Amino acid sequence: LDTAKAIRQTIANLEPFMPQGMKVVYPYDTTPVVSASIHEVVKTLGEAIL
Amino acid sequence: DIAQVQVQNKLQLATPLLPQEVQRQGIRVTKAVKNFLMVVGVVSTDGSMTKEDLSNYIVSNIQDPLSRTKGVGDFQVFGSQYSMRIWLDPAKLNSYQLTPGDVSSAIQAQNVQISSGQLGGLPAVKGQQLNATIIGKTRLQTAEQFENIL
Amino acid sequence: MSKFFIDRPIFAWVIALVIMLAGGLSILSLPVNQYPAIAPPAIAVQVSYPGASAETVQDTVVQVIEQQMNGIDNLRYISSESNSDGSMTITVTFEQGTDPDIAQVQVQNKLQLATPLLPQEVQRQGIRVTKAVKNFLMVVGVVSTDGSMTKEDLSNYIVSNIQDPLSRTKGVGDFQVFGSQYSMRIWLDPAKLNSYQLTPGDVSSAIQAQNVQISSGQLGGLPAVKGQQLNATIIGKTRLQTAEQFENILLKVNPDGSQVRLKDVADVGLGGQDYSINAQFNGSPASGIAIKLATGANALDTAKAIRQTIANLEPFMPQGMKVVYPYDTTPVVSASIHEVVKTLGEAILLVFLVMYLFLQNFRATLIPTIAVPVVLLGTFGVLAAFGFSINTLTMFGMVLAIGLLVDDAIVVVENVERVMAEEGLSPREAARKSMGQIQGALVGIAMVLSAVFLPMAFFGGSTGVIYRQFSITIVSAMALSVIVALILTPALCATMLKPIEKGDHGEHKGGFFGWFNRMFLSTTHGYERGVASILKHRAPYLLIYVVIVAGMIWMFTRIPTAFLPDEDQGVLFAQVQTPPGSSAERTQVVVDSMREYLLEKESSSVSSVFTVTGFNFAGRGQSSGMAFIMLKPWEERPGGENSVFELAKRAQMHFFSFKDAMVFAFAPPSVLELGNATGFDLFLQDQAGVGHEVLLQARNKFLMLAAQNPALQRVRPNGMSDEPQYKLEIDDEKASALGVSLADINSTVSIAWGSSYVNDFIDRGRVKRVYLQGRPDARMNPDDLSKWYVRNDKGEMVPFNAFATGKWEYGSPKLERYNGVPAMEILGEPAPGLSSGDAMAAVEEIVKQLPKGVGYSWTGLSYEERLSGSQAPALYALSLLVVFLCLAALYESWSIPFSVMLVVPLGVIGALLATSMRGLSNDVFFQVGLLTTIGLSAKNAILIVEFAKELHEQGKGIVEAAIEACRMRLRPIVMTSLAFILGVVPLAISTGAGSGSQHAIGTGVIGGMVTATVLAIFWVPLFYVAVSTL
Amino acid sequence: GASAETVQDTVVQVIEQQMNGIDNLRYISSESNSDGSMTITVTFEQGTDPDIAQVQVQNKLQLATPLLPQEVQRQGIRVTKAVKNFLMVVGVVSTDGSMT
Amino acid sequence: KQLPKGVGYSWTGLSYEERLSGSQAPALYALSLLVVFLCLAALYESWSIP
Ligand SMILES: CCCCCCCCCCCCO[C@@H]1O[C@H](CO)[C@@H](O[C@H]2O[C@H](CO)[C@@H](O)[C@H](O)[C@H]2O)[C@H](O)[C@H]1O
Ligand SMILES: CCCCCCCCCCCCO[C@@H]1O[C@H](CO)[C@@H](O[C@H]2O[C@H](CO)[C@@H](O)[C@H](O)[C@H]2O)[C@H](O)[C@H]1O
Ligand SMILES: CCCCCCCCCCCCO[C@@H]1O[C@H](CO)[C@@H](O[C@H]2O[C@H](CO)[C@@H](O)[C@H](O)[C@H]2O)[C@H](O)[C@H]1O
Ligand SMILES: CCCCCCCCCCCCO[C@@H]1O[C@H](CO)[C@@H](O[C@H]2O[C@H](CO)[C@@H](O)[C@H](O)[C@H]2O)[C@H](O)[C@H]1O
């Protein structure tokens, strides 16, 4: 998660100098499951404590 | 970190026994995981840039920076950076009795970046007032400059 | 716990006994050095590509190494310079904390991988990688009193005789000789070479031929023939050694039989390898070493050991060779250990006095004298555990601790002493009784104080390392001080104090003591009354409290903020930059019209000058010069007029008359390792290959724009400016049409002008380098090349003027890059009264007028302050929230904690007042001093509240509880403040080595101590009653 | 091709300069042979982390290396931990004498 | 001792280890008497027993 956020950040510090007909995209990408994973348990944490 | 140091510690015992064309190509030792974490692609908006134009972009401006973004173990660019490619024609080549090793050679005598010293050079004679850099031969950059190689 | 050790004085003594052993066995396994590692650890990758130009070095060496520098742990950023002298540096930068030895190795490894991608010529040179922190222990210098030896000579010596042993000298870490070994020098004559139709390249291939140790196998190797019986290695010939042997390596023989020896075409003599840099001691030829302290070493012991080792070498040193120690950080380190053991000693002496004067009994006077030293020994052990060292910061952090150490003792003893007096209880009984009273409070205050000093520690960066020292050593002592105030001291009180006749306050003793007790007895009665007065007419006072506050804030928004005090190190720098194009010979004088000047007109303050041609702080080149103006010990040059900061002003003005060479004076930074302490630091960067020239439009627009911006000042680009460079055009059309190759021309221009490092000979043992290039008068001016010919198809020498042509253009004398792309650094600073933050603000807007494809990023201290700056809110608020919660626990109340927190301002006003009133700045010492002063203050408040709450709960109304509380607390407070102020006075008015730090610390606690003492003794009871009334 | 005396004047001696000053150094012992071989053995106090003393070793040598003969710099100095004792030998013997 | 003044000596390996072991021994005995002394002089609240 850190190294992924670090990357979104290195590129975003580069987009402004990118040419015109050009956008940065994210084909494959493993982090989202992870965010979804715990975020989804945090979700269940609250349901149970309730 | 100890691993990497140990491999490379041994790796640099082979290195010299390796063929030059391989040493010259730059070897990479990395300490990273097996899975790709991700990939960052680039695509043309006004559809004006080829597969190859996007690749020269990545390796030429982004790749290093990611190379050094805390935590990137290793990377793979599905593409390449530009290169001054010289496509040899064996017919024209026969015409003047030339060989690739002739053109590989001219390129090494004519597309160079020599140390040339300077006027005010040290050590200098007593009295010398002027000093400037002497820029001799430089590297080409444009097809045109290579096209015109003697 | 405390009632446990009152009955166990021996056990209690055993604890103290191992605190003392641990601390003593620790004070001598402990490293001793000026500062911890403040700078972010950096690694320097270096090489000189002889005869090279900034562009060849950058594109042939630096870029390729940068392209494979990655996959490296804790890398903050990378930065490099390619120079006109063929040298370069690539400094990688990691987080503070990065393991240096590991960071290094990660960088040389990937260097290793890149080395085969480099020109064969740089590969041969080496490319040294090394740890680049600027924390030099001392710096010697082998200077020739006369003129017998040159810079090159002196060097080879230091590395032939002075080096190897110095490395075996205990404590010595890294060191750099100002120079390399001897290099066999061959200066080819274009004329004496054209006359035999010979070319430099004939010499190189030749030199190589007649100078190569041949393996030569064995005389009986394996397999062997049946028998032999005798096997012996066969040792062939060895490589050349003497200048003569080199003058012999024949090149060709004339048909008439006559032969041509190398001597027949050029000179031959041992010499320097690289002449780029020149250096003289007060004007005499010189070299030297720059040493660092080995990990864990003793700054003091090594200095002795260096001077030791050197001495045993001075006898045999040639006539004229004088060793010398221009710069040494030992005097400041030593004059800091004393200037602490002295204050520590005085403190315990002063405490005795105040302890007597008031308590009038020697026994009670012994206790504080036991505990304070116990605790001070402990702390060292505790630092040892933590891995800290005995440095400038850890020590002063001890000085600051003293108020708090002396305090814990005094409160414990004064309060037993008092209980015995009021209730006629006995030592034992009183001792239990006191500790029943306080005790929680002290655990309470140990917590609250940790919550006031710990958050600092959590700062990232450089300001984080400094603060972490003060923080960890202050709170270690504090925590120890409390432990000992709970185990030992109460035990010592029960054991060592005699009883007092209940109600006896000695107002009868007559004489001085007789007078004093009546005086103080009345003074107290006065105070309870004032306090009682205030507790009647409150609002008006709460009112005035609001004005104490508002004044604090306002007083904050007016005090000059700084990183660290303006220390007078015995040194001052002087940067010399002559006009672009200037020859070293020119610059050499521009730096002498200074030396002669400094060394003489300023003899009152100047001892010797160390000057250099070729090197500078903006760049390198013949137009780049500098002088390292030493100074004699602080002692032998008092009075502001002879301050490094005053010497400057003079030095400057003189140099002012210099419409021919930019000259500047400036005292070095407070902590060298960091350099630029005040201002901002950033790189302008081409993040789109826009190009040098474009990029340079940026740095010039940036500059002449930011200077229309009334938020910045002194904005100077850091690197160099393009000068004129003599380009060479080669018409190959006439080259191939003249029978002259093209590779032979290049080899000609390289191996004759730029120089060529060809072979490795053998010099008096070790191996050194053979250098081949044209004799001086053959490579000075554009016509000099016309002097050089090359053989053709046959053997017709073709002069360089028959196909080559000249042409002057503009080029970079110094190329820089930051994170892989070309870049340009700009310094400067904030406008008077404005903060570095504001300054970055203006800049964050300027940058927006940039050309397309140019970006920027902060570096160095601006990179850092931008990170620490952002956590402060969080830290400041955790500090408040835990002090709150701990006082809530102590008093069993959500509101009463407010009646001691509201003393913060009370004391911080007198600090702002005293410091501003003395012209000092809001720096490190002031800030940590302000936490110390407010810690003690709040301890005074806490106890008062605590007592009152007790009185209050044992059946007395709020205002009556507050009056009694303050009356009971006054003697304690007056004693610790009376004694703590006087302890610091000597720092407040000190002079000499390190006096600048001692002031930044004395001026702050005195002010904070005075106002805080006198004001909290009046407003806390107000606060306490004011909030209980709500 | 060089004598034990060369191996020492142009190699070992130089590498030893860099080895002085290393953390937790007990002693260093080197040997120069007449077959072009050498060994510098650098010894450290117990408790010293050996992975890290090697790295300090590599870091120091890298500064001697350029001052070595180019016949070595192209070669490659070997750096390894130093165990004084063999644990065992695993030999191989031919019975019918089929293999020498 | 019968060596040409110019040639000294210096122990190593096994020996080195020996000359150290000797060195330790004293303080080892001193400090060890101390710990036993203090621990008794605290566990029995007296100086007489220790
Ligand atoms: C109080 C401030 C005192 C400042 C003193 C500064 C004086 C320094 C003078 C240095 C003079 C030059 O000394 C310089 O030494 C460096 C090594 O460190 C040499 O470095 C040279 O050999 C080394 C290998 O040994 C190569 O890796 C390098 O590529 C090559 O340039 C230079 O060839 C030599 O010119
Ligand atoms: C994760 C752990 C973090 C812990 C942080 C909590 C910090 C706690 C600070 C120490 C406070 C100890 O406070 C302890 O208890 C109570 C207060 O409620 C007090 O006991 C009190 O009781 C009586 C009547 O109630 C009063 O006469 C008098 O004020 C005092 O004797 C003592 O002053 C102290 O012995
Ligand atoms: C009884 C003993 C009690 C005394 C000990 C108290 C210690 C003080 C605790 C502070 C240490 C916490 O460490 C600190 O955490 C905060 C909060 O996450 C961080 O702060 C981080 O998150 C916060 C909240 O989003 C941001 O506003 C902040 O700018 C960001 O840096 C700090 O950068 C970090 O340095
Ligand atoms: C018996 C007595 C005991 C007394 C001893 C108490 C020891 C307490 C020391 C705490 C040391 C904290 O360690 C320090 O944490 C800070 C803040 O998180 C780090 O700083 C880092 O943290 C935060 C992350 O949230 C970032 O915002 C910040 O930019 C980053 O650099 C330091 O790089 C680290 O060195």
Q: What count of Cα atoms within 13 Å lies in the side-chain half-sphere of residue C254?
A: 9
Residue C886 CA: nearest ligand 2 atom is: 7
Cβ proximity of C192 and C744 under 8 Å: no
Distance to chain A for C692, nearest Cα, Å? 16
Nearest residue (by CA) to ligand 2, atom 32, is: C440
Exposed, middle or buried by CB within 10 Å (0-12, 13-18, 19+), for C456?
buried
Please give the radius of gyration of chain C, using alpha carbons only, rounded to the nearest integer. 36
| C104/D20 Cβ within 8 A | no
**How close C319 gets to chain E, by Cα (Å)?**
26
- The radius of gyration computed from the CA coordinates of chain E, to the nearest angstrom, equals 20
Burial-class residue B90 by CB neighbours within 10 Å (0-12, 13-18, 19+). exposed
Task: Judge contact between C419 and C436, C-beta under 8 A.
Answer: no
Pick the closest to residue B128 from C583, C9, C690 (CA basis). C583
Residues of A in contact with B71 (CB under 8 A): 2-3, 6
CB C177 within 8 A of CB C289: yes
Write out the DSSP string of C809-832.
Answer: EEE-SEEEEETTEEEEEE--EE-T
In the chain, the amino acid numbered C390 is I
**In this structure, is the dihedral angle defined by the CA atoms of residues B11, B16, B18 and B23, taken in order, positive or negative?**
positive
Looking up residue C307, the CATH number of its domain turns out to be 3.30.70.1320
Pocket, ligand 3, Cβ cutoff 6 A? C 447, 450-451, 454-455, 458, 870-871, 873-875, 878, 882
Q: How many domains does chain C have?
A: 8
Counting ligand 2 atoms within 8 A of each CB, the residue from C432, C439, C890, C894 with the most, and so the one to mutate, is: C890
Give the separation between CA B35 and CA C460, rounded to whole angstroms. Answer: 32
Exposure of A44 by Cβ count < 10 A (0-12 exposed, 13-18 middle, 19+ buried)? exposed
Assess whether C562 and C600 both reside in one domain.
Answer: no
Domain with D11 in it: 1-82
Q: Is the peptide bond before C776 cis (omega within 30 degrees of 0)?
A: no
Token couple for C162:
């002075």
Cα of C449 vs centre of ligand 3, distance in Å, is 17
**Distance between CA atoms of residues C766 and C788, nearest Å:** 35
- Cβ of C460 less than 6 Å from ligand 4: yes
Q: Which two tokens stand for residue D63?
A: 């500064």
Residue whose CA is closest, atom 5 of ligand 2? C886
Q: Is the CB of C874 under 6 A from ligand 4?
A: no
* Alpha carbon nearest to ligand 4 atom 23, residue: C460
All residues of chain B having their beta carbon less than 8 Å from the beta carbon of residue C742 are: 109-110, 150
Chain C residue nearest residue A10, CA to CA? C819
Looking at this protein, which amino acid is placed at residue C516?
F
Kindly state whether residues C533 and C560 are assigned to the same domain: yes
Name the residue at shortest CA distance from atom 23 of ligand 3.
C874
- Give contacts of E40 with chain C, Cβ < 8 Å: none
Q: Are C339 and C463 contained in the same domain? A: yes
Per-residue buried b or exposed e for C843-874, using 16+ beta carbons within 10 Å of the residue's own CB:
beebbeebeebbbbbbbbbbbbbeebbeeeee
Which chains would you list as touching A if contact means 3+ CB atom pairs under 8 Å? B, C
In single-letter form, the type of residue at position C313 comes to L
Beta bridge partners of C186: C772
| Cα C454 to middle of ligand 4, angstroms | 9
SS3 content of chain B, % helix, strand, coil (to 5): 40, 5, 55
Task: With an 8 Å CB cutoff and a minimum of 3 pairs, decide whether chains C and D touch.
Answer: yes
Q: Looking at CA atoms only, how far is residue A33 from chain B in angstroms?
A: 12
Distance of CA C347 to the CA centre of its chain: 30
**C158: amino acid identity, one letter:** I
Contact between B46 and A21 under an 8 Å Cβ cutoff? The reply is yes
Question: In chain B, which residue's Cα lies nearest the Cα of C120?
Answer: B24
- Residues C361, C486 within the same domain: yes
Say yes or no: C470 and C354 in one domain. Answer: yes
How distant is the Cα of D91 from the closest Cα of chain C, in angstroms? Answer: 23
| C914's tokens | 């005293």
Experimental method: X-ray
Ligand 4 within 6 A of CB of C472: yes
Q: How many CB atoms lie within 10 A of CB C884?
A: 16
Query: Which residue's alpha carbon is at the smallest distance from atom 33 of ligand 1?
Result: C274
Closest-CA residue to C875 (of C459, C307, C347, C273): C459
Are both C390 and C434 inside the same structural domain? Answer: yes
Q: What is the CATH number of the domain that holds D39?
A: 3.30.70.1430
C28 class by beta-carbon count within 10 Å (0-12 exposed, 13-18 middle, 19+ buried): exposed
CATH number, domain containing residue C759: 3.30.2090.10
Distance CA C127, CA C88 (A): 10
Q: Whose atoms come closest to the Cα of C285: which ligand?
A: 1
Which chain C residues touch E43 with a CB distance below 8 Å?
11
* Cβ–ligand 2 contact at C953 (below 6 Å): yes
The residues on C that touch D, with CB distances below 8 Å, are 101-102, 104-105, 108, 124-130, 163-164, 167-168, 172-174, 181, 213-216, 233, 235-236, 238, 294-296, 760, 762, 765-767
